[PDB]
């Protein structure tokens, strides 16, 4: 149960803020959970997905496949992996859009800033 006077349970308002969320706001909404191994490694559950990260699909038809996030397609609330695609009938190839909540992060791309994030959440890093 909410308890504060400044959070709204309202469904209309919630859908509205989702679908019209600004780019910066979607980076955080698009988080992926870490892998069992990465979670022990860094003592941390999840992180906003970020491009050159390495990732395992764990729901849906692509369950079990893996690769590198090639773009975080924030406009579409979706992520693309160079290694997970549709081959069309005309032989042309086309990315498939995946949701971070359906991935698992198996290798992080690290910055000063990424490390600084993991630390701010009280994690530990190899």
């Amino acid at each position: 149960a909410k308890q504060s006077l400044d959070v709204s349970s309202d469904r209309r308002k919630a859908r509205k803020a989702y679908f019209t969320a600004p780019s910066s706001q979607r980076r955080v909404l698009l988080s992926a959970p870490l892998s069992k191994e990465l979670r022990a490694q860094y003592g941390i559950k999840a992180l906003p997905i970020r491009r050159d990260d390495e990732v395992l699909v764990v729901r849906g038809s692509k369950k079990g496949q893996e690769g590198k996030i090639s773009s975080v397609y924030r406009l579409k609330f979706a992520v693309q992996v160079d290694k997970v695609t549709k081959e069309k009938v005309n032989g042309a190839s086309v990315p498939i859009n995946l949701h971070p909540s359906k991935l698992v992060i198996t290798k992080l791309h690290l910055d000063k800033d990424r490390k600084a994030l993991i630390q701010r959440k009280g994690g530990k890093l190899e």
Binding site: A1, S9, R11
Partner: protein
């Protein structure tokens, strides 16, 4: 109060082979010529527009209020009522079910559930939980999306943690004896709520 009425539309009088509701004037848009205002008109004002000064609340004599909650309390004894009301008390130790004042001091949900279970509420707790459904209404999109039954009502004399250790368990409610509310004692006006009384609360009753 202005809907249906944001036109300058006029009747056309008779002699024009056409019903005499007012009609929007002007030309060139498809709206013009059309029935206006009346309640049978697309875009008309409704019959008897609802008004905020409708009566919403209701006065009840304080003493009758009390008669009712007194009756309701009396019925939380009387197993068959409690049974009839839903409520899975077919194997609780006894009724009224009174429990140690130590309950009011539990801070932790998991301990709180443990205790309710021990004293016999396992099956009512399970009934809520087994009963979540999407509501059949349009209610479903007016902040009223799910449905579920009512669990036991835990009553205490002093909140020393219990109202907070219980607030997250589905269907379980808590009340101070000093208050005590008819909406909870007889949900939907059906006598019989399963009530678990702390001793401290059971004796404050008199």
């Amino acid at each position: 109060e202005k809907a249906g009425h944001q036109t300058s539309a006029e009747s056309w009088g008779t002699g024009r082979a056409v019903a005499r509701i007012p009609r929007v004037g002007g030309g060139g848009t498809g709206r013009s010529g059309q029935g206006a205002f009346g309640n049978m008109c697309r875009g008309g004002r409704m019959f008897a527009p609802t008004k905020t000064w409708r009566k919403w609340n209701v006065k009840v004599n304080h003493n009758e209020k009390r008669y009712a909650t007194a009756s309701a309390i009396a019925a939380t004894a009387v197993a068959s009522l409690v049974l009839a009301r839903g409520h899975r008390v077919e194997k609780i130790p006894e009724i009224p079910l009174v429990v140690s004042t130590d309950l009011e001091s539990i801070q932790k949900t998991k301990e709180a559930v443990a205790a309710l279970k021990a004293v016999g509420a396992h099956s009512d707790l399970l009934k809520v939980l087994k009963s979540k459904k999407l509501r059949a209404g349009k209610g479903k999109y007016r902040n009223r999306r799910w449905t579920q039954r009512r669990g036991p009502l835990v009553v205490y004399a002093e909140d020393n943690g219990i109202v907070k250790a219980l607030r997250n368990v589905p269907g379980v409610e808590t009340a101070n004896v000093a208050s005590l509310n008819l909406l909870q004692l007889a949900p939907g006006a059906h006598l019989g709520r399963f009530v678990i009384w702390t001793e401290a609360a059971f004796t404050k009753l008199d």
